[PDB]
Design an enzyme around this catalytic site. Structure first.
Site, short mmCIF file in Angstrom:
data_model
loop_
_atom_site.label_atom_id
_atom_site.label_comp_id
_atom_site.label_asym_id
_atom_site.label_seq_id
_atom_site.Cartn_x
_atom_site.Cartn_y
_atom_site.Cartn_z
N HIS B 40 -46.37 -10.26 -88.68
CA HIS B 40 -46.79 -8.79 -88.24
C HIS B 40 -48.02 -8.61 -88.33
O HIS B 40 -48.27 -8.10 -87.24
CB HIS B 40 -45.50 -8.08 -89.66
CG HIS B 40 -46.41 -7.90 -90.80
ND1 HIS B 40 -46.27 -9.19 -91.61
CD2 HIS B 40 -47.71 -7.05 -90.87
CE1 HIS B 40 -46.73 -8.57 -93.19
NE2 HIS B 40 -47.76 -7.91 -92.40
N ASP B 62 -41.39 -15.25 -94.32
CA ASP B 62 -42.22 -14.43 -93.08
C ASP B 62 -43.59 -15.91 -93.75
O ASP B 62 -44.50 -14.28 -93.47
CB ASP B 62 -42.43 -13.25 -93.98
CG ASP B 62 -42.83 -11.86 -93.76
OD1 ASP B 62 -43.30 -11.85 -91.75
OD2 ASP B 62 -42.93 -10.48 -93.65
N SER B 114 -52.94 -7.27 -95.85
CA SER B 114 -52.08 -7.95 -96.22
C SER B 114 -52.88 -9.57 -95.80
O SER B 114 -53.22 -9.53 -95.46
CB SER B 114 -51.25 -7.76 -94.84
OG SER B 114 -49.77 -8.44 -95.41
#
Lengths: 163, 163, 163, 163
Positions: B40, B62, B114
């Site tokens: 993302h 991910d 993140s």
């Protein structure tokens, strides 16, 4: 010490960086009413006047050039062809001119410092830094320069890496 | 106090941010000769070496991973699987490891932090922060970790928000 | 002096600059619960709350406008229909109001000066600057404003420049 | 704090809490010789004489008007319609009245403090608080009031929650 301060005082207003999503990858040059800018450095001109023009290309000499308007031709760099061997001023200190070749000591040199002009003890541009190649301890430059006749000579050593 | 200084001293050279038009939205991780980077978080790698590679993808776990060359494998993070319960070091202070779950006290946590690895009292990465969910007063983390067998386990609580 | 500092205190909270790629092109005003943005200025509003709102356009008055969310409605500027002659305030010093013409002593007012709300002797917005022309030794402005009926009135002198 | 003493000393005789299982849900107000009570508040009047009445409903204005016995018609609030801009004196301090809207600084206003009157600097009721919505740093109020013609007017902002 004071040489970098003189470079920052001479190249303050006349040097405009090239932006590419916030990254500084090159520097144009405003000299003689002409805007020199390389091919491999791609991005937008930070100046608003110089960005809304059309630059004629020369892929063999690796130069884009344009016409600076008359209201800015007085605020340009100086240029000459008479140059002896020895030392010259560069943005990261000194540069040696030996046997018609520009050499820079190691430690400095990365991707992004392309287009910085080489100055002298008087304040005239003698060369434009385009690339560099690592030679032992002392790197060599791939640049352009002029002559007495008026022919732009591009000097390029073997196996250079574009900056 | 000194814990944030130890995090800044350990994660100084090995942590590279991800740029997106000047915005810092994520952080990659260089550990074990591998470059971990989430899905993302989209943008360009600030490092010039790590950006000119090809990252194999894993959308279920991910994670994008790549191969760090041999001249940089010594300057990576450390990693282990032996972890007890209790306290661990994180970039904004401390993090609690209880019942196999990472919990962070509130006040901190936004969009952009993140990919920050979780360190211990010795200096080894035990988890990689990917997401977080607000639980009462004390938020929980959605992370990845390893085990004794060698299987990358992705722990994800209910209704998490990606950072 | 003194007048500009309370205007800076007001503009730090509610006047938002736009984000062109490296510079500021214009200023979005939030007055009365209705966000205002000039048309020739192109970029992105700094707030992620004020960026997502789709704006309606009014080409006769050179202003995009959108609806302000409900939380932001109390933290807006105030607007005044009644303006007597004399002196009003502005980010770049003072502005004269004479015969229905907001004029400014010259030397100031260039590109990137758009959407700055002209305040008053109380803290309420009476006009929004969109540009101006150099009327000899003193420049006049091209603003939109309001009257007693509730009708947005735009005044523009001869051959103004979209700043 | 001096105005809040006046409000408490005027509410000590003429304001009655509407208690359901002991919990406060609202306040009956005896202004001008008629009992007032909102619809959505559930419970009974604390005063025994006022609880044994037949309050005629009026479902539009969120009120349940009644009539006051003749021995109690002098122990009522006085009221007015006259309302210039400025400040008024609520139960929790002050309340701004600008552009025909009563606004309280935020935080205060929950389930239960509905039916409270808003006083002026003379000691007359100008509004009766029914509900309100939090517009960020300041809460607009939904009240009923009167005007110069002698007509009960209810103002209601958007998305008001019944208190």
């Amino acid at each position: 010490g004071k040489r970098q301060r003189m470079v920052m005082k001479l190249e303050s207003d006349k040097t405009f960086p090239i932006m590419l999503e916030g990254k500084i990858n090159g520097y144009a040059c405003v000299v003689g009413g002409k805007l020199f800018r390389p091919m491999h450095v791609e991005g937008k001109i930070d100046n608003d006047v110089l960005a809304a023009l059309k630059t004629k290309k020369a892929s063999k000499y690796d130069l884009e050039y344009a016409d600076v308007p008359q209201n800015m031709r007085a605020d340009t760099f100086k240029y000459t062809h008479e140059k002896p061997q020895g030392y010259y001023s560069w943005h990261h200190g000194a540069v040696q001119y030996e046997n018609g070749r520009f050499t820079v000591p190691k430690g400095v040199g990365a991707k992004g410092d392309s287009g910085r002009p080489i100055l002298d003890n008087q304040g005239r541009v003698v060369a434009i830094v385009l690339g560099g190649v690592n030679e032992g301890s002392r790197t060599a430059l791939s640049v352009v320069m002029w002559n007495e006749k008026g022919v732009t000579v591009k000097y390029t050593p073997e196996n250079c890496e574009q900056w």
